Amino acid sequence: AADWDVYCSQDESIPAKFISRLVTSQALEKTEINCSNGLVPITQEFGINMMLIQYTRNELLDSPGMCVFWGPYSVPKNDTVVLYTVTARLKWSEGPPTNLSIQCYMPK
Amino acid sequence: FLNKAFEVALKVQIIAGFDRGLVKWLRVHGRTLSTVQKKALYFVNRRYMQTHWANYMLWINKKIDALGRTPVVGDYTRLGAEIGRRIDMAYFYDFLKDKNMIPKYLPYMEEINRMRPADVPVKY
Numbered sequence: 001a002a003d004w005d006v007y008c009s010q011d012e013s014i015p016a017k018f019i020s021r022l023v024t025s026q027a028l029e030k031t032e033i034n035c036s037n038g039l040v041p042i043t044q045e046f047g048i049n050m051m052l053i054q055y056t057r058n059e060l061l062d063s064p065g066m067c068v069f070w071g072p073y074s075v076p077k078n079d080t081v082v083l084y085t086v087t088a089r090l091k092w093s094e095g096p097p098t099n100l101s102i103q104c105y106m107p108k
Numbered sequence: 109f110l111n112k113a114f115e116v117a118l119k120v121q122i123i124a125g126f127d128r129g130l131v132k133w134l135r136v137h138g139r140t141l142s143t144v145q146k147k148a149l150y151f152v153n154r155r156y157m158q159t160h161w162a163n164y165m166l167w168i169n170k171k172i173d174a175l176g177r178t179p180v181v182g183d184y185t186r187l188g189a190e191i192g193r194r195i196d197m198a199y200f201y202d203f204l205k206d207k208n209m210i211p212k213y214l215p216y217m218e219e220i221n222r223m224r225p226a227d228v229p230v231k232y
């Protein structure tokens with residue numbers, strides 16, 4: 001009932017773009033993004049929704065809703081990328097919540 | 109929850125601030141955009157406020173609490189203008205144009221664009 005993507009950047013100075021589309025009849029009660037600097041709530045409206053996700057905590061300013069990736073993490077397969085990630089929890093009016101993983105690999 | 113006068117004062121300033129930034133960006137990058145693509149970006153501004161209203165309220169409530177006095181509508185005007193300014197929406201405009209991802213302009217977007225900012229629905 002929800003679709004989403006993340007569009008990752010090639011440099012830590014440019015934030016990633018999270019884009020979701022909500023198609024629903026059970027309503028969506030809450031959406032919470034679990035970021036390295038805290039839990040950020042959003043309200044996914046009918047159709048398209050958008051959010052910026054910063055790669056570094058050095059991009060935080062005194063402003064609402066900023067979200068920093070957890071990471072960077074090394075991955076086991078190779079040493080030419082690192083992983084940045086957040087998760088999202090979607091609480092529906094009925095049934096169990098939906099848990100989403102939002103991942104960006106950054107070349108090194 | 110929030111008194112209607114305070115909600116309107118917020119929304120008018122947030123949308124005003126986002127729209128100012130888009131006009132500036134369009135002066136440089138709008139030449140090759142279609143009319144509906146420009147309208148899509150105006151909708152992006154209104155929808156961004158809707159999507160983030162929950163975390164706006166968290167930040168606003170902390171600022172209002174810090175007043176140490178009963179708030180007035182001017183306090184919310186001020187905070188709404190700060191929210192409208194303290195973000196570079198060009199990260200979206202640039203990304204959407206550069207990657208040919210400006211959303212298809214659909215009627216639910218036109219409906220929001222035709223509203224007065226004071227009337228744009230938000231959820232708490």
Ligand SMILES: OC[C@H]1O[C@@](CO)(O[C@H]2O[C@H](CO)[C@@H](O)[C@H](O)[C@H]2O)[C@@H](O)[C@@H]1O
Pocket residue numbers: 037038039040061062063064065066067163166167170
């Ligand atoms: O724990 C989050 C809490 O922090 C506040 C202000 O103290 O907002 C800051 O932290 C948020 C992370 O969750 C950021 O999203 C926000 O940009 C930053 O100001 C509150 O708004 C929030 O409840």
Ligand SMILES: *[C@@H]1O[C@H](CO)[C@@H](O)[C@H](O)[C@H]1NC(C)=O
Pocket residue numbers: 034035038039087
């Ligand atoms: C965020 O998720 C991590 C696991 O990825 C978890 O340890 C933490 O409890 C979560 N934060 C909150 C505020 O629930």
Ligand SMILES: *[C@@H]1O[C@H](CO)[C@@H](O)[C@H](O)[C@H]1NC(C)=O
Pocket residue numbers: 075077078079080081105
């Ligand atoms: C390195 O590992 C990451 C994650 O497993 C993967 O996305 C990427 O394609 C890998 N790179 C190469 C060159 O295999």
